[PDB]
Copies of this chain bind each other. A is one copy, B any other.
Amino acid sequence: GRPEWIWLALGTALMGLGTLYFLVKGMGVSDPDAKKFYAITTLVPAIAFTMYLSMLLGYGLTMVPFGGEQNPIYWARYADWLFTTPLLLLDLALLVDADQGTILALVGADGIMIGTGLVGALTKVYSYRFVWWAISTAAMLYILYVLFFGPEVASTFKVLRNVTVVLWSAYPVVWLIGSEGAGIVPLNIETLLFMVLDVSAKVGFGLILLRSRAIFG
């Protein structure tokens, strides 16, 4: 029905498989630290899976009036990211044994990032949408700042940090030019971009982490 459906179906499938793979891979792990990383990393795509399914079936989709039109907004993404983005930061923070003050800063900022993103997404005054985008972006930049200025461990963290910064930074650009923002890129193509980003930031990120010896004490 909706041209973006194929990407949602493929997104659902790839999150589903990634979840199952990490579930299997994690069986037999007894190391307490390793358990933590498997739990976090498996839960990410499991949640993403349910929200991709939500969007595919049309449950995670609403219409937001602005700019003199009914704009199709997939709210289910913010429900996803609200839980998955903090968990991904938690993998990075636990990897470097970050202290609780820094964890709370990252989680807090993340919560704000997604929350303002959501408000932006559903705002009916076109111009205001972008005020929310700017605040959320500030919060993202704060997160990237902490990650950078807040041997196997070092090495794996550096790789996952670089992966994070490049992928996460693309989301505000996609949002801004997409159907939630300027509407210069059509929803179908926006949906494809977000699937590639999400699968890379969840399953891609997850394969790198769970194959490393850093997760083990």
> Is A100 part of the binding interface, using a Cβ–Cβ cutoff of 8 Å?
yes
Question: Which residues of the other chain, B, contact A32 by a CB distance below 8 angstroms?
Answer: 99-101
A83 within 8 A of B: yes
- Contact status A54-B101, CB under 8 Å: no
Contact with A123, one of B57, B109, B123, B125 (Cβ below 8 angstroms): B57
User: Is A163 an interface residue, CB under 8 A from the partner?
Assistant: no
Does A38 count as interface, using CB distance less than 8 angstroms?
yes
A36 within 8 A of B: yes
Any B CB within 8 A of the CB of A50: yes
Q: Are B59 and A108 in contact (CB under 8 A)?
A: no
Q: Are B39 and A135 in contact (CB under 8 A)?
A: no
Contact pick for A128, options B36, B47, B57, CB 8 Å: B57
A209 to chain B, nearest CB (A): 14
**Which residues of chain B come closer than 8 Å to A204, judged between CB atoms?**
none
Closest chain B residue to A125 by CB distance?
A: B57
Question: Do the beta carbons of B104 and A54 come within 8 Å of each other?
Answer: no
Tally A residues with Cβ within 8 Å of B.
Answer: 39
Residues from chain B with Cβ under 8 Å of A40 in the complex:
104
Interface string of A58-81 (1 = CB under 8 A from B): 110000000000000000000000
Within the assembled complex, what's the spacing in Å between the Cα atoms of A116 and B34? 28
Chain B residues, Cβ within 8 Å of A33: 101
Q: Is the CB of B59 within 8 A of A104?
A: no
Chain B residue nearest to A101 (CB atoms) is B35
Cβ of A187 under 8 Å from chain B: no
Q: Name the residue of chain B whose CB is nearest to the CB of A47.
A: B112
Contact residues, A84-125 vs B (CB, 8 A): 99-102, 104-105, 108-109, 111-112, 115-116, 119, 122-123, 125
A83 and B111 contact, Cβ closer than 8 Å, known pairs A50-B135, A53-B131, A59-B123: yes
Instruction: Give the chain B neighbours of A115 by CB distance below 8 A.
Output: 50
Q: Which residues of B contact A46 (CB under 8 A)?
A: 108, 112
Residues of B within 8 A of A104 (CB): 36, 39-40, 43
